[PDB]
Every structure is written in structure tokens, then in C-alpha cells.
Structure 1
Amino acid sequence: AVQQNKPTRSKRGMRRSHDALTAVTSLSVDKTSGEKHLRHHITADGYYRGRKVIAK
């Protein structure tokens, strides 16, 4: 339940080796408006695959 000796910075650091975040690195430019967005996601303006899908 409790530890007998405290973990070091090594044991803490080697545990956090897999806690690093992952980048997206796959930004897709829009077909018509040419704005960056995620794959299979609409843009902030409301464009998806060139069509103004949201009209809002």
C-alpha cells in the first residue's frame, strides 16, 4: 500500500517517458477557402470538402 523508499527523479522520469503528448502534423488545407482544419472535420468558417456545409 505504501512505499519503503522514495522513488528518485530517474524512476519518476522514466515513468513519464510515455506521458509525452503527440502532435497532429496532418493539417489539411481546404479545397475552396484554403483554410487549415483537421481531417474529416469542418473548418472554423464552416467549410467541408469545398462546400459551405453549415451556412452559418
Structure 2
Amino acid sequence: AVQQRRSSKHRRDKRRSHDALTAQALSVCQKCGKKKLFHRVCSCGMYGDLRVKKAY
């Protein structure tokens, strides 16, 4: 159904207290200076000392 008394700003704040997004982990590529994702390739391609994509 619907609410019978209005929800206060305190109620919504306590409800959204869990809204904070997590800090995603990063990693530094071994040949292209940049902060890429983790277990993931960067904009150059060398996921390791091994490539896969052409340029992007």
C-alpha cells in the first residue's frame, strides 16, 4: 500500500546512508603510464607484457 504518515527527512537520510559508492580498485600498467582497472586492459593494450587490441 502507501504510507499513512509522511516520511521525514531523517528517515530518507537514514535510508540513503548506504548510498555511498565503493572506491573501485585501480592498477598501473607496466608499459603505458596510466591508472587502469584491475585484471583489465588499459587504453594501449598490453594487459601484461602481451598485447591484444590495435590502438584503442
- Report the TM-score when normalising by structure 1: 0.79
Q: Which has the higher strand share?
A: 1
CA distance in 1, matches of 2:45, 2:7: 50
| One-letter amino acid matched to 1:30 | C
- CA RMSD between the two structures: 1.4
Work out whether residues 32 and 44 of structure 2, in 8 Å CA contact, stay in contact via their aligned partners in 1: no
Q: Which residue matches 2:17?
A: 17
Residues 46, 53 of structure 1: alpha-carbon distance in 2 compared, 3 angstrom cutoff: same
Unaligned 5+ segments in structure 2 are none
Aligned position for 2:45: 46
In 1, Cα distance between the equivalents of 2:11 and 2:53? 50
Q: Distance in 2 between matches of 1:54 and 1:34?
A: 17
